[PDB]
Amino acid sequence: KVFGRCELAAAMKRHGLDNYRGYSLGNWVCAAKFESNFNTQATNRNTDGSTDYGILQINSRWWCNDGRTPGSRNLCNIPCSALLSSDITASVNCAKKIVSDGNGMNAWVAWRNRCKGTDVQAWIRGCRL
Ligand SMILES: [Cl-]
Ligand SMILES: [Cl-]
Ligand code: NA
């Protein structure tokens, strides 16, 4: 499923990302945009053999099991495919675990590179929340 920008902002809030660990909703929306273009089914192979999945491109090296990332962990205790669902519950929950891991959203390199330091409020501007 490919969400609309305001559609994704509302769902992320309903799912509690709003100011989670101090990250306002616009940070999350911004990250989702650049990681997956708002597409729950997005996947990309990393040069190390791991793969990123879903709207926030969560990695199989650490967070989910996809059965083909040797020596990896499954910290979110979920199969990576659950991160590709129209239902963003597993991606949201696993994202909360990641942002809580001590480096916050810097875990998302694309957030650090394209959102951090910018006016992220623009991502939820216009949206009824
Ligand atoms: Cl594996
Ligand atoms: Cl932080
Ligand atoms: Na894994």
From Swiss-Prot:
Q: Which terms does the UniProt entry file under GO BP? A: cell wall macromolecule catabolic process; defense response to bacterium; defense response to Gram-negative bacterium; defense response to Gram-positive bacterium; killing of cells of another organism
Q: What is the protein's name according to its record?
A: Lysozyme C
What domain of life is recorded for the organism? Eukaryota
Q: Where is the active site?
A: E35, D52
Another remark in the UniProt entry says: Lysozyme C is capable of both hydrolysis and transglycosylation; it also shows a slight esterase activity. It acts rapidly on both peptide-substituted and unsubstituted peptidoglycan, and slowly on chitin oligosaccharides.
**Keywords attached to this entry:** Allergen, Antimicrobial, Bacteriolytic enzyme, Disulfide bond, Glycosidase, Hydrolase, Secreted, Signal
Disulfide-bonded cysteines: C6-C127, C30-C115, C64-C80, C76-C94
Q: Where in the cell is it found?
A: Secreted
- Assembly state and interactors? Monomer.
Q: What is the role of this chain? A: Lysozymes have primarily a bacteriolytic function; those in tissues and body fluids are associated with the monocyte-macrophage system and enhance the activity of immunoagents. Has bacteriolytic activity against M.luteus.
Residues recorded as binding substrate, renumbered to this chain, are D101
Which species is listed as the source? Gallus gallus (Chicken)
